[PDB]
Every structure is written in structure tokens, then in C-alpha cells.
Amino acid sequence: YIVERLCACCYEQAWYAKLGGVVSIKFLMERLPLTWVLQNQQTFLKALLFVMMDLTGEVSNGAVAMAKTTLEQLLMRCATPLKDEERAEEIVAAQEKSFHHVTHDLVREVTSPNSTVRKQAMHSLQVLAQVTGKSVTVIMEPHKEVLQDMVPPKKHLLRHQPANAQIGLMEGNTFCTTLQPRLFTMDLNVVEHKVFYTELLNLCEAEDSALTKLPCYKSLPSLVPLRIAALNALAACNYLPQSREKIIAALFKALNSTNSELQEAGEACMRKFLEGATIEVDQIHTHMRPLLMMLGDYRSLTLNVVNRLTSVTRLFPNSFNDKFCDQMMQHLRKWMEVVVITHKGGQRSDGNEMKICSAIINLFHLIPAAPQTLVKPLLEVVMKTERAMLIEAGSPFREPLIKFLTRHPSQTVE
């Protein structure tokens, strides 16, 4: 009755009721013995995860972090292997049964449409596989019966599912297909996987003007998380030779865009994609061609294009050459002259004041093709700008310049 009434507080509406319920659960699992907390771990987990499922979308006072910490403690407690001095026929059986049930419910809630509970379940599975000294797959291999119809959409026309459910399915597919050994192999041969891959490609490659026509996406405020999830799911399929060019094309299209958050998501997915696949300089040039071929005019530069340059350089150091370094130095000199002119004019702040020059300078320390000779012209232009603006302490060019100078200490100090 104690556990019933106390964990029942987790189902009340108010947030303080949930907080008291989780506090009582923590007290019960910390003070009382192991043999008893195991058989109640099912109800404890259910209640303390329903707390999260219900508190999403409303103000709360640290209840989410407290619930996450309590979940971590309960999982590392009940999952801890029993030492030989305490192993017995009843405690071992109770632990095994509680572990089975908890893992079953966790794999069930993994594909839930809520993001917070899904991330919490993923972290719990990871830490549980870490503690038990086993892989996540072998632990989920018996439990994948629940996800036989979840990871494969069964050609359910995901376009009919809501945006949050779609994002949840994408994240579940990414998690289940990115373990040490993959639980489900997206062979891209059955009609189900084929339809799923085609939907992923059309979602991550189409345009917003046509993508917003769907009713499921008509009410979305940003539509960026959906594209991010689509890119993440598409990168997890780096085991299909005959169907790899489209993945690279989509990842590069996402790596060259006029948005910052999506550019970062695309570069992250590419870095994750390169862990299993490889890309030769041929297709690198083929895909970055529209990114280049426009730098001829220094005015064409901007924060987005320099960020894309930085990303493609960080992902492929051997892609750029010394000629590109000289062109970048010329563009930097031009932009520094423009900045000096604008500062002498003293009209008003703009969006091309310092960030562009800082990014262009940082580009050098990431390109290994940058020669030692580039230190002197860069220092000269930096000194010219500093003494034209008379900004010494607040100069934002110090950090990237020092980052580059550290690459050639011999020439620098000389």
C-alpha cells in the first residue's frame, strides 16, 4: 500500500505532487533492501517515466533532472551484477526478471513520440549496457520482438503520422541501426525498407515550398527538426554500396545551405557518415562546385559561405590547395580594407563587421595546405587594421591568428 499510494502521486496533475512522488521513490529505493526494490522496479520506472512524459511542455522546478538522476541511480543499482558473496537462487531470479521487464518497457518506450523520454531511454540503455559489461544489441536482441513493426514502418505511409511521431520514428531507427552490431539491417531490398528510404530521401532532399504542402507539415513552425532527423536517419545507412551516392548527395546538399543550425546538423551527420563510408576527392569537388566558383568576387562572401568552407575543410583537410589559401588571403585583405573604410566612416553597425574576417582567419589554421609564408602577410594586414581602428584589447582577430600562428612557431617567432 505504501508503494501504491506513493507512486500514485506521480499521476497527479500538479508538479509538486510528481516531485513528492519521485522523492518517495528515491527514499524507498535508497533505504530499503535489494530483494524488495527489484520486484517494484517495474512500477517505479513506469511512474517516474510517466512523470517525464506528462511534464513535457509545462513549467517545472527541477523535477526532470531529479527524475533523470533517480532513474540513473535505480538502473545502476538494479542492473549491478550480484557479487559471489551475495548470489542466491531467489535474488538472482528476481534480478533477472526485473531486468527483463525493465528492458522490455524501455525498448517499448524507445520509439515513443516524446523526445525527452526517448533520449532518457536511450541514455538508460547505454549506461545499462555499460554497467552489465555487455553490448546494447545483445541485451536488446531478445527484446527486438517489440520493434519488429516499429523500426520497419511496414509501409504505413509515414506522411499520415504526425510530425512528432515521425521524428520519434526517425530517432528510433537511428538508435537501433547505430549500435555496435545493428539490430535491424536496412537492406533496402524489401518494399518496406525501400518505401522508408524513399520517404527519407524525399523529406531530406525536397524543398520547403513543396514540403509544407503536406497537412502533417502545414502546422509545423520551423520544419528544421524534421530535416535534421531525416539527415540523421539517412546517414545511418552507410552499408549499401549500390545505394550510397544518394546518401552522399543528400548529406552534401544539407552541408551547403543558407541556415546555421541545419548546416551544423549536416556537418555532424557527415562526420558520422564518414565513420563507416568514405568519399574520394572526385565527388567532393563535384558536390562543392557550387560552393566554389562564386568566390571570384570578395563581396560574395558571408557568414554562411565561410562557415560552409570551414566545415568542408574540417571534414576534408586534403581537399584544398595553396592557391585557395592565396585566394582566401586576397579576400581577407579586401574585407579588412572594407572594414577599415566602414570604421573610418562610422555610420552604424552592420552584419559584415568582424565575424567574417574572424572566420576567414580561422579557416587558415584548419587548412593543412597553408604554408609558413602566410604568417607575414596576415600579421601585416592585422597590424594595419588594428592601428587603423586603434582596437588592441577588444580586437577579435587575436584568437584565430594565434590559432594559426601556433601551426608555424619557427617562422612565427623568427
Side-chain angles (χ1 to χ4, degrees), residues 330-391:
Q330 292 179 4
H331 295 170
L332 174 138
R333 190 175 286 108
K334 293 291 293 186
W335 274 104
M336 286 300 216
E337 292 292 351
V338 173
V339 175
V340 172
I341 292 285
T342 52
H343 192 274
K344 178 176 176 60
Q347 302 176 0
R348 189 170 297 174
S349 159
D350 283 88
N352 302 6
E353 56 190 350
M354 302 297 182
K355 286 174 260 60
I356 292 167
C357 299
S358 57
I360 295 163
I361 298 167
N362 188 277
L363 269 168
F364 295 122
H365 89 82
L366 293 160
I367 299 162
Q372 294 181 4
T373 306
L374 218 72
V375 302
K376 166 168 182 180
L378 198 63
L379 276 157
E380 287 282 11
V381 296
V382 163
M383 260 302 308
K384 185 170 279 289
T385 50
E386 173 271 355
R387 221 145 204 77
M389 300 186 298
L390 299 181
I391 302 173

Side-chain angles (χ1 to χ4, degrees), residues 177-228:
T177 61
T178 56
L179 304 177
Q180 270 174 22
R182 67 194 77 265
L183 279 157
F184 298 91
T185 306
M186 195 68 67
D187 57 357
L188 192 54
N189 188 87
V190 71
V191 68
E192 279 65 60
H193 296 165
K194 180 61 177 181
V195 172
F196 178 58
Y197 164 85
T198 50
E199 289 291 353
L200 284 170
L201 187 61
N202 297 23
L203 175 59
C204 94
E205 191 175 3
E207 292 180 352
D208 299 0
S209 87
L211 185 56
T212 54
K213 292 291 188 297
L214 286 300
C216 51
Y217 310 145
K218 185 67 174 182
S219 279
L220 274 169
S222 315
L223 194 57
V224 178
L226 285 78
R227 290 181 174 276
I228 295 166

Side-chain angles (χ1 to χ4, degrees), residues 293-302 305 327-328 331 334-335:
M293 192 171 66
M294 64 160 83
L295 314 173
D297 186 5
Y298 79 99
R299 181 62 59 177
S300 81
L301 296 178
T302 175
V305 302
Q327 178 173 130
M328 278 295 106
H331 295 170
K334 293 291 293 186
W335 274 104

Side-chain angles (χ1 to χ4, degrees), residues 76-195:
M76 66 86 66
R77 270 278 302 286
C78 296
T80 282
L82 298 152
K83 304 299 182 64
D84 303 288
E85 61 271 12
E86 46 179 327
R87 279 181 61 89
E89 57 263 59
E90 83 293 31
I91 179 58
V92 172
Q95 179 172 52
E96 193 269 352
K97 188 162 71 75
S98 160
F99 177 92
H100 184 83
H101 286 305
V102 164
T103 49
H104 192 78
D105 273 327
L106 279 174
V107 302
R108 161 167 279 108
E109 304 283 9
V110 153
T111 58
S112 55
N114 189 311
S115 45
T116 306
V117 311
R118 175 166 61 267
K119 297 296 193 308
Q120 176 52 217
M122 293 161 65
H123 173 62
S124 58
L125 280 153
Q126 288 179 356
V127 68
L128 171 138
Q130 286 173 193
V131 171
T132 54
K134 297 180 178 180
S135 87
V136 177
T137 300
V138 69
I139 287 169
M140 293 174 63
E141 176 61 16
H143 280 314
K144 70 182 183 180
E145 171 66 6
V146 179
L147 304 174
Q148 291 192 153
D149 301 330
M150 297 294 174
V151 153
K154 197 230 177 184
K155 180 243 159 193
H156 259 289
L157 304 176
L158 297 175
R159 275 174 287 180
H160 297 66
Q161 299 293 352
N164 70 334
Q166 286 180 11
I167 296 167
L169 291 173
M170 296 319 89
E171 290 193 4
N173 281 262
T174 55
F175 175 81
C176 294
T177 61
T178 56
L179 304 177
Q180 270 174 22
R182 67 194 77 265
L183 279 157
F184 298 91
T185 306
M186 195 68 67
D187 57 357
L188 192 54
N189 188 87
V190 71
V191 68
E192 279 65 60
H193 296 165
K194 180 61 177 181
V195 172

